[PDB]
Symmetry: C3
Subunit: 160 residues, 3 copies
Amino acid sequence: QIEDKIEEILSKIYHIENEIARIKKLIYSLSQSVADRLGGGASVNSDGTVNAPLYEVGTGIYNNVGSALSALNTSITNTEASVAGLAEDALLWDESISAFSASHTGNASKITNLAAGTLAADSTDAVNGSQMKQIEDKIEEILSKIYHIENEIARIKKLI
Amino acid sequence: QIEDKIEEILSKIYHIENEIARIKKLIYSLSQSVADRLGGGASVNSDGTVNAPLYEVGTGIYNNVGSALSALNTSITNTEASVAGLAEDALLWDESISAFSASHTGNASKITNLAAGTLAADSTDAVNGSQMKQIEDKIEEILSKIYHIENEIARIKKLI
Amino acid sequence: QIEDKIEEILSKIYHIENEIARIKKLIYSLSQSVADRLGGGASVNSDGTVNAPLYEVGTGIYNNVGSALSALNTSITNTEASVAGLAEDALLWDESISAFSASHTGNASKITNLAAGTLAADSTDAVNGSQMKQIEDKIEEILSKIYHIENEIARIKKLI
């Protein structure tokens, strides 16, 4: 049973060598598939490791998934900060009062840098201070003409 | 020392077979753990590779991490573009002047499609062109009555 | 050829043991590289598996890439929802009419909580209902003075 024992040792060694060649190929296949699922140019190195992906987020490049996710989180944070800024400063429709509200930090506020509205019976343009001042000037002139009328009348009222 | 040498060859072969069965199981365990850390339904294929994850971002499905990160970057980009649009077009509080500003691209601008404000001593409603026109009409009528008064007065002024 | 056959069996076994030690080290190197490319503190466990990353997105922690991507998708969704809210409610520049528009859901709308505008010949401040009411009161007083003038005139008109 000695030459027989050698015969089978050589055959079992042959099966082991086949397993090793199959295992070596399983490892690079695994490695390749992982590189594929990472994307961003991840590839398999000559030594069997997965070379780093290159992920572009914003103006930066990230060599791992966590750093990219973090960068996306920060971008969304910054965009939310801009949105909250707009929301604090925008002249907004207020549903509770059915109107746009020029309230700011609890106070009625001005609107300024407003160009003059068309004055017509069907104009829906807002009007400004310059336009109302011209009306106020007309009114003051009307009152002076009236005071002149009251005096001219008074003179003839006594002179009779 | 010949049968002894066989005895140990069979024992060393037995240790190698145990190592191979342990290595085969290490590879599928590694593979499984990688599938778990990727998520998105990644699983281990019969051949030992990691099947692709399916990541939903927006209206698309992405089969690798890089393509998903890219898609998230583009969504945030698009949302920032909407925000910048709002910021260019919104009627905004200007802290430097303590007031909302109807400035647009450096010019005083109109506000139009404005419904008529309540006219009362405590109204904080904006007023429109139609409302100011009605005032201007009243003023023109007042001036004609005054001119009629000046003439009636003049007639009696000479006729004495 | 029997002792020779043993000589080479021991040498082929020696090459196989070297391959196994090289393969064991390839697996932990692969594992390490995958842990590195995942980031978020992913590390290699004693058993050769990749321990889970810890990815922070918003106020949550996610133990796999898919769940993190999902969380980033939901955050961007929520930020877009805020932006669309602003866009529906903001008083906006309308390029088609070259003016800010106080239109809301197809209707001319009020602006209220507006503080009084400066009345001067170069004021670009919007004016409110309280300011226009004071003008209307002045006008009513002017008309009563005129009616008094018409009566005083009429009396002297007949009395001659």
